[model samples]
Target: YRAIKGMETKREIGGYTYKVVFYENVFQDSILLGNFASQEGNVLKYENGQSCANGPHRSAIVTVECGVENEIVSVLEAQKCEYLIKMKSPAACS
Candidate 1:
């Protein structure tokens, strides 16, 4: 009954620091970034972020898996406004 939302997380991309309250919104450079997160199955997708030169806002598609003892995450892909993220946490048992 618990997973990513049970944790606050942060990641660094393109020299910018991004933070998230998981189920809530995301932040960048201490500024408000992204809309609320949407969950489907074991995946948490965050959107509505700040745009670069002339494109849509940044977004992250995070999927969860098993890591056994530690919380582990990785940026699987980054293209345009999409960020494909993969994560593994201790709460993963389904």
Candidate 2:
């Protein structure tokens, strides 16, 4: 259960704060988002890593609108089953 440093942080946008987490090898670990609303649209899937060990990570730059306490509404994976989660809430704004 290793975590990536600097991969977890919070950002403020559109008067809301969004916290992002990037998990390492989360796909091989067999972790799922559990039936959450999948992000729709053209999400850029970037190719990273080489060989069967290192995999790729997906990235998408988008804008979202969140209200008070709006948190963890969606969960999804990237090119290599990496966990990418977004949480927006007043608690995270600080």
Candidate 3:
């Protein structure tokens, strides 16, 4: 259910699969990393969830593919610090 930092991983949970990517903070370049995280952070928070308060190394971009993207995207801010991007799992073509 969690992604390793600086790596792309595939995880399955609750009978669903997800492709996840985690972005870690750039310690050497604070300004650039800060800006990028801030911008993308709010974008997801507003579009994906209601509100977000992410830390320095808690930024990520996850891609969830599905047969129909229209009715399968939901966001949940689980607890006070976690953001869950709920998207439909790709339908099996049989």
Candidate 4:
């Protein structure tokens, strides 16, 4: 664990599985990479990055999708330093 240990979720994207934990980060082995998270509507934002001189990119977003009881979508890397992910959870069905 990178920070204080916490809950974690497993998701697969583009044939690649991602593990979203409260803390602990592995270089290039994680996405929506971060040790902390916040909430926005039905989305969970993970951020563990700080301002840098050469573009500090170390974070990921997990959107909520309703339908499945608890399922995770895939991840997409649109550009440098960021990752996008979505999942299906019962909570979002509300």
Candidate 5:
């Protein structure tokens, strides 16, 4: 598991983190809102196999920074896949 500093360290604004797991396929294109951050919260890996393995360590991290007051929306995968996590959490503050 890769830690993006505040992403997993800070629980103040507690957000949901999802892992895509390592895949053997080479992702030619970037997902709609997919990006990689630093493990120390300082830099981002831009290359193909910098911090994530094509299949071995191909996990991902996503965060909902919208807070708890607003209507919490869907957290889903943008593509067609056999695995997923569908969860509805109460408003972070509510």
Candidate 6:
């Protein structure tokens, strides 16, 4: 079976959920997002984006909820499914 690849979020504030979505990627795009520069330490700063325009959007956060069983979530637009999927997943949770 294919994997449901994307973020999964939940919020305590009103008990909401959101997914940090990404825009699009180029030929070299990866199934997963790039890594932070923090791994490189003092020499490099962790940039939120990349040199390529395929980087993430400035404001594309979406909400996700576990209302359905089996990790259920969907994308309204198939063209940007990846980004939408990310939006469904939240970035602020333990």
| lDDT winner | 1
- State the displacement of the C-alpha of residue 3, model 5, in Å, after optimal TM-score superposition: 7.0
Structure candidate 4, residue pairs in collision? 2-24, 13-74, 32-60
Model 5 off-target regions past 4 Å?
1-4, 9-65, 69-74, 80-94
Query: Ranking under TM-score, best-scoring first?
Result: 1, 4, 2, 3, 6, 5
Worst lDDT window (10 residues) for model 4?
Answer: 22-31
Clashing pairs in 6: 7-89, 9-90, 17-63, 17-64, 18-63, 18-64, 18-89, 18-90, 19-87, 19-89
lDDT of 2 by residue, 1-94 (tens): 6544323334443344444432221121222212212334322121232233344333322223434754445544443534344444443333
How many backbone clashes does every candidate have? Answer: 0, 0, 0, 3, 2, 10
Residue 44: error of model 4 in Å? Answer: 0.5
lDDT of 3: 0.32
Q: Model 3: residues >4 Å from true position, as ranges?
A: 1-65, 70-72, 89-94
The sequence of per-residue lDDT tens digits that candidate 1 reaches over residues 1-94 is 6444456667775566666565775665675555566777777677877664456677766667756742325554366666666666666557
Q: List the residue pairs that clash in candidate 2.
A: none
The sequence of per-residue lDDT tens digits that candidate 5 reaches over residues 1-94 is 7433222111111243332211211121333123343322221222223233223333223332335332223334333321112212232222
Candidates' TM-scores?
0.65, 0.29, 0.25, 0.61, 0.21, 0.23
Candidate models: Cα lDDT each: 0.62, 0.34, 0.32, 0.56, 0.26, 0.26
TM-score for candidate 2, please give it. Answer: 0.29
Instruction: List, residue by residue over 10-31, the lDDT tens digit for candidate 4.
Output: 7555555677553443123333
Evaluated at residue 20, the lDDT of candidate 1 is: 56
Residue-level lDDT of model 3, residues 1-94, one tens digit each, is 6523533334444344433333432111121111113324223221222223453223233324444421224434353434354443333111
Model 2, stretches more than 4 Å misplaced? 1-67
Q: How accurate is candidate 4 locally (lDDT)?
A: 0.56
* Model 4 alpha-carbon drift over 4 Å, by segment: 1-7, 12-16, 21-32, 49-55
